[PDB]
Amino acid sequence: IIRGWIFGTTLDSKTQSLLIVNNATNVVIKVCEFQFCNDPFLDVNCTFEYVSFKNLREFVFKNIDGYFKIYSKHTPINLVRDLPQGFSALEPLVDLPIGINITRFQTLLALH
Amino acid sequence: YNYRYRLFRKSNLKPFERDISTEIYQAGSKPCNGVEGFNCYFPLQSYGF
Numbered sequence: 517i518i519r520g521w522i523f524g525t526t527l528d529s530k531t532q533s534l535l536i537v538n539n540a541t542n543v544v545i546k547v548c549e550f551q552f553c554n555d556p557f558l559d560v561n562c563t564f565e566y567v568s569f570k571n572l573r574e575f576v577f578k579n580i581d582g583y584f585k586i587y588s589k590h591t592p593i594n595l596v597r598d599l600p601q602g603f604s605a606l607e608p609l610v611d612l613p614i615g616i617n618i619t620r621f622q623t624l625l626a627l628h
Numbered sequence: 629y630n631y632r633y634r635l636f637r638k639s640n641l642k643p644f645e646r647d648i649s650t651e652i653y654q655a656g657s658k659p660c661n662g663v664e665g666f667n668c669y670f671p672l673q674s675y676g677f
């Protein structure tokens with residue numbers, strides 16, 4: 517039901533803004549300059565574009581010299597309420613040359 | 629005049645940062661609200677090639 521993120525400065529998306537969307541079959545990534553919605557939608561004009569509970573998914577995001585790096589890990593878990601007590605290390609997914617300023621972000625979820 | 633250079637105000641680029649219009653990043657002290665006179669319009673030009 518959780519599926520992605522929006523990042524940027526203004527988040528109007530006339531201003532450039534990273535979008536990341538999982539759609540179960542793929543991960544889809546864009547930097548768009550099209551005016552986005554007031555409130556995000558996932559009902560059941562971009563300079564760059566790309567395409568690839570009992571469980572926990574972890575992601576680390578950082579933006580350095582216009583490279584947006586992503587690291588991740590997936591695991592089973594037995595407490596839903598709190599972050600797990602044990603130790604694990606995330607591994608690099610991607611290292612994206614998007615070239616954009618980022619100070620604000622939001623998350624995307626599927627809707628009835 | 630199809631070849632352009634962008635600005636001359638406050639904030640300046642990180643390495644491989646790209647910069648684009650959406651609001652008038654104006655050319656002096658005062659807000660402009662679409663004015664192009666004193667302090668105003670983007671500090672954006674073209675080369676006389």
Ligand SMILES: *[C@@H]1O[C@H](CO)[C@@H](O[C@@H]2O[C@H](CO)[C@@H](O)[C@H](O)[C@H]2NC(C)=O)[C@H](O)[C@H]1NC(C)=O
Pocket residue numbers: 525526617618619638639640641642
């Ligand atoms: C990256 O975006 C931030 C806004 O989120 C810009 O920071 C602001 O810049 C103005 C001047 O242009 C300052 O008056 C504000 O105080 C700044 N705000 C913050 C939160 O720092 C930043 O300038 C942008 N980067 C570049 C290089 O333009």
Ligand SMILES: *[C@@H]1O[C@H](CO)[C@@H](O)[C@H](O)[C@H]1NC(C)=O
Pocket residue numbers: 539540541542544567
């Ligand atoms: C996911 O997005 C790609 C294009 O980015 C599309 O080909 C694919 O059919 C989409 N899948 C779903 C389930 O929407």
Ligand SMILES: *[C@@H]1O[C@H](CO)[C@@H](O)[C@H](O)[C@H]1NC(C)=O
Pocket residue numbers: 530549550561562563564
């Ligand atoms: C659409 O994106 C291009 C660059 O990808 C940009 O030149 C253009 O100004 C954008 N259009 C809008 C409506 O911002």
